[PDB]
Amino acid sequence: RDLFQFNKTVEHGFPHQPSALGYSPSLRILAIGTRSGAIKLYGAPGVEFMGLHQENNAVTQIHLLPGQCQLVTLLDDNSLHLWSLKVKGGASELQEDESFTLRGPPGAAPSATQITVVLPHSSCELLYLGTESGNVFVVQLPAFRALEDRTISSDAVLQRLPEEARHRRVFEMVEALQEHPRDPNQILIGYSRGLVVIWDLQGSRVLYHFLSSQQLENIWWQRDGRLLVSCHSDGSYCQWPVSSEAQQPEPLRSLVPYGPFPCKAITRILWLTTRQGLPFTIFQGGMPRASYGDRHCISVIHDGQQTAFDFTSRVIGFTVLTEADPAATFDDPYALVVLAEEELVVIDLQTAGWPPVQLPYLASLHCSAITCSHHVSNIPLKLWERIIAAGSRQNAHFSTMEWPIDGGTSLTPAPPQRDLLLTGHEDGTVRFWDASGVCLRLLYKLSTVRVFLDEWPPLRKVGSFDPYSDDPRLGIQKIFLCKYSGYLAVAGTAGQVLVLELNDEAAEQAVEQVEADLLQDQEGYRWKGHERLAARSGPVRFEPGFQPFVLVQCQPPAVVTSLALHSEWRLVAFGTSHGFGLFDHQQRRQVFVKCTLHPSDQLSFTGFVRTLYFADTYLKDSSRHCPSLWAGTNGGTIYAFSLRVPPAERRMDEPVRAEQAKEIQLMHRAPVVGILVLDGHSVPLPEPLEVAHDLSKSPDMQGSHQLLVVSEEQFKVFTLPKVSAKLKLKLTALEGSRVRRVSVAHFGYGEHHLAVLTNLGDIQVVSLPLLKPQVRYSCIRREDVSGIASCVFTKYGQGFYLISPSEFERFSLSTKWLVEPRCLVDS
Ligand SMILES: [Cl-]
């Protein structure tokens, strides 16, 4: 009751399927819209807002009103929505105030009022809406009263033009609609066919116009408003002077920025001024159709320097952060924020070389496909500061610029403990995330692949997302990190097992290789496809961080399915689809292997090891406890091997010798998803070196131990060493649910329980050792098999699961580790 509680929290990572980018230069807050109707506001680390439109429709445009805590969104159904940041109870929240849909006359065409450009007037009193017909409608905010009196019709503009500039297309689409930077009375209107016009609002007269030789794509207005830069569908951009003395000019300077060959269109362009007199020219597209046409590029030109920033995904919006306010003399940019379809990129425009800016949030967790995730709770400070130190040297090429999107004040207090989330990926990388309280930022990246062996246009790949799968054999399957010693054990898809060690400096060392033939005592089989990797024979140099020292290749090179790493005994247990083996990573010697293949297996088998578990309990003698290894398979078989490890003073002088002690078969023959041994007080045996750092955690050896077996169908408790049954809990026979994952959870005095994730998406808690159902929740849905398979628990009642390939959703079952992210946006 007063210690169990499940509530939704926040989400981590890059939003799934974005479609709109917004940014308030005053508030310094980034806004992202998705194809599911969600808008996410991002400010300083800890300041985040999320909203949902009641209709499931993609967000196409986001316009944060100038100098106000409001924004206007446009969905693909031509709907407008006014959102605000109401401060309710010392902390601001996001809410949708009003809504409006542009209609048009009844008998009119539906696309005639399809909004193309939304112009928030500087007064924050009017919205100027460009449509596909060419008409610009005026909407007054709030109340959203479409003022039909102020409508600027298409032919109403053409009547002020000479006769030779009146050739109008049926749908003269408004592709440009901007306000004069120094005159709120003048607005610019841009049509597709090439007509650009400056309009006198209070007077209804055309003050300036020119026809474009090429189709109009976009335009940009200089700070003083005395020059226009238009980009066109032929891949060219030209400059136009704006002066009341010459209301009808010809272009000042035209060029196609990339080669004399045909080019793709330039969809957008910016003309930013600097105090040094060197303007920034930033345009998207314009790449040649000849070869570089299928590439998403954004080019920046400044002081004789050109760089075509190329992204691995579509560009669904970009902006440039400037030091200027609407009243400043010069723009002076310093950052280029690009919201790609799969990632977010920030480029430092001030530092010479234009280096990437490190992201404090919005990091694309799926830059490589996530294959596994492992959570380690409460990291000691000596290892914590060591990982953040080794992870700082690898981020040297990044900019020294502080995160520019610092808008807002996070009210969430500091995290209680240092939690750590690890993610294995398909390309062989492991990433260390700071899942302490809420914010999930990257600390260190590990690349395991190291064990296995033009000039124009100025293209330059940026971002970390790789949309290709070079080799799936590199995929990380199992991850184990000892927070006390720094030993890391990772397992791959091709049957590789790497045991790494964390040191502070670099090293050039050879990685010893040991073949673990799981089929040594059985012959008559031959592997078919997915052959093993190829390790470097020579001594490989490694950067500071987790350096590997031993490699164990399983034969056959099947996927590793279970992993256990005992740091004190210096043993690592690995298991594949056919068998398992115990390895002595201190002497780099194979202790034993056992082929578990049933005489008649499948074409998943029965001898498929699923769980590995080290323990120091009583197996044979009732009064002598010795190290042991436990292995559970799909056939309900539970193996137990008595281990004899030497003391630390002779660990390098005697081999570790094992001997099978028990073979237990559950009579319902359900797969074993968890083995666990309890001490005299029914407390689970502590992890390796957990007692070494807190000797009061020494397990009760006086008093009979208990064996806890968790299968896919039921829970059974035994009594060591005689392993006689004493308790049962047939969950599948009752609720009709099967156990997907189980984990010991310590809630808060504080006693231990069993956290169970069923295949239904529910999560139940079970007491120890009586196995009494304490509570039952509903985290994931039943149809969400993708997310329920990649769901991870923590020691203290917290969890993570994937709502999309890119986003983790966090949840907490404990009342003591609740976190409600509060933040404040002011002025
Ligand atoms: Cl702990």
3-state secondary structure 436-475: CCCCCEEEEEEEHHHHECCCCCCEEECCCCCCCCCCHHHC
Cα 586 to averaged position of ligand 1 atoms, centre (Å): 25
How far apart (Å, rounded) are the C-alpha atoms in residues 659 and 234?
Answer: 77
Rounded distance from Cα 565 to ligand 1 centre (Å): 17
Integer Cα distance of 131 and 555 in angstroms? 65
* Ligand 1 centroid – CA 432 distance (Å): 18
Please identify which residue in the block is written with the tokens 């007509």. 195
Instruction: Return the SS3 of 786.
Output: helix
Torsion-angle region of 212 (φ positive above 0: left; ψ -120 to 50: alpha; else: beta): beta
Left (φ > 0), alpha (ψ -120 to 50) or beta: where does 787 sit?
alpha
3-state SS class at 508:
strand
* Sheet of strand 420-425: strand arrangement: 370-376, 420-425, 429-434, 441-447
Distance (angstroms) between ligand 1 centre and the Cα of 410 equals: 28
| Cα 261 to Cα 808: distance, rounded to the nearest angstrom | 46
Distance 645 CA to ligand 1 centre (A): 25
Which among 39, 25, 26 is positioned nearest to 83, based on CA atoms?
Answer: 39
Q: How far apart are the CA of 501 and the centre of ligand 1, in A? A: 21
If you measure from the C-alpha of residue 739 to the centroid of ligand 1, how many angstroms do you get, rounded to a whole number? 25
Q: How far is the CA of 742 from the centre of ligand 1 (A)?
A: 18
Kindly give the distance from the C-alpha atom of residue 797 to the centroid of ligand 1, in angstroms, as a whole number: 13
For residue 426, the 8-state DSSP code is: T
Rg of the Cα trace of the chain?
32
Query: Can you tell me the distance from the alpha carbon of 562 to that of 549, in angstroms, rounded to the nearest whole number?
Result: 21
Resolution in A for the shown PDB structure?
3.2
CA 316 to chain CA centroid, Å, is 18
Q: Which helix (H) or strand (E) covers residue 567, if one does?
A: none
Joined tokens for residue 636: 């309900």
Residue 816's nearest CA partner among 794, 791, 798, 792 is: 798
How close is the Cα of 46 to the center of ligand 1, in Å?
Answer: 26
| Strand order across the beta sheet in which 126-131 lies | 115-120, 126-131, 136-140, 145-152
Do 46 and 405 form a contact (C-beta atoms < 8 A)? no
CA of 378 to the centre of ligand 1 (A): 6
| CB-based contact 495:525 (threshold 8 Å) | no
Q: What are the backbone angles phi and psi of residue 382, rounded to the nearest 5°? A: -65, -35
589 exposed, middle or buried (CB, 10 Å; 0-12, 13-18, 19+)?
exposed
Q: After which residues is the chain broken (C to N over 2.5 A)?
A: 453, 603, 748
Ligand 1 center from residue 434 Cα (angstroms): 17
CA of 381 to the centre of ligand 1 (A): 13
**Residue 805 burial by CB count (10 A; 0-12/13-18/19+): exposed, middle or buried?**
middle
- Chain mean position to CA 590: 38
Q: How many whole angstroms from 374 Cα to the centroid of ligand 1?
A: 16
- List beta partners, residue 498: 490, 551
Q: Which of 400, 389, 386 is nearest to 353 (CA)?
A: 400
- 308 vs 328: CA distance, rounded Å: 29
Given the DSSP bridges, would you call strands 459-461 and 305-311 parallel, antiparallel or unpaired?
parallel
CB atoms within 10 A of CB 785: 12
Q: Taking the C-alpha atoms of 233, 239, 244 and 249 in order, what is their torsion angle to the nearest 10 degrees?
A: -70
Given strand 459-461, what is the order of strands in its sheet? 266-272, 280-285, 296-302, 305-311, 459-461
Report the 10 Å Cβ neighbour count for 526: 7
Ligand 1 center from residue 125 Cα (angstroms): 57
Which neighbouring-strand residues pair with 626? 617
Answer for the pair 747, 2: CB distance below 8 angstroms, yes or no. no
Å from CA of 714 to ligand 1 middle: 28
Distance CA 475, CA 368 (A): 10
What single-letter amino acid sits at 761? G
Q: How far does the centroid of ligand 1 lie from the alpha carbon of residue 394, in Å?
A: 29
Q: How was this structure determined?
A: X-ray
Q: What is the DSSP letter of 267?
A: E
Distance CA 566, CA 691 (A): 13
Q: How far apart are CA 698 and CA 616, in angstroms?
A: 12
What is the dihedral sign for C-alpha 302, 303, 305, 306? positive
Cα of 822 vs centre of ligand 1, distance in Å, is 28
Ligand 1 centroid to residue 482 C-alpha, Å: 11
Q: What are phi and psi of 387, to 5 degrees?
A: -70, -40
Task: Calculate how far, in angstroms, residue 695's C-alpha sits from the geometric centre of ligand 1.
Answer: 12
Closest CA to 731 of 673, 794, 648, 646: 673
Specify whether the CB–CB gap between 619 and 640 falls below 8 A.
yes
Question: How many angstroms is it from 2 CA to the middle of ligand 1?
Answer: 22
Interval between CA 747 and ligand 1 midpoint (Å) = 12
CA of 112 to the centre of ligand 1 (A): 64
State the Cα–Cα distance between residues 548 and 542, nearest whole angstrom. 9
- Going from the Cα of 690 to the center of ligand 1, the distance in angstroms, rounded, reads 7
Q: How far is CA 294 from CA 221, 310, 311, 465, in A?
A: 29, 11, 11, 17
- Residue 794 CA to ligand 1 centre (angstroms): 11
Ligand 1 geometric centre to CA of 707 (Å): 22
Going from the Cα of 376 to the center of ligand 1, the distance in angstroms, rounded, reads 9
Distance 271 CA to ligand 1 centre (A): 56
CA of 680 to the centre of ligand 1 (A): 20
| 480 C-alpha to ligand 1 centroid (Å) | 15
Rounded to the nearest angstrom, the gap between the alpha carbon of residue 613 and the centroid of all alpha carbons in its chain is 31
571-575 and 59-64 as β-strands: parallel, antiparallel, unpaired? Answer: unpaired
Residue 379 CA to ligand 1 centre (angstroms): 8
User: Counting Cβ atoms within 10 Å, is residue 5 exposed (0-12), middle (13-18) or buried (19+)?
Assistant: middle
Specify which residues 200 forms β-bridges with: 186, 205
Q: Tell me, in angstroms, the distance from the centre of ligand 1 to residue 578's CA.
A: 34
Rounded distance from Cα 569 to ligand 1 centre (Å): 19
The rounded Å distance from CA 377 to ligand 1 centre is 7
In the chain, the N- to C-terminal Cα span, in Å, equals 42
Q: Which of 366, 364, 374, 538 is nearest to 450 (CA)?
A: 538
Å from CA of 687 to ligand 1 middle: 9
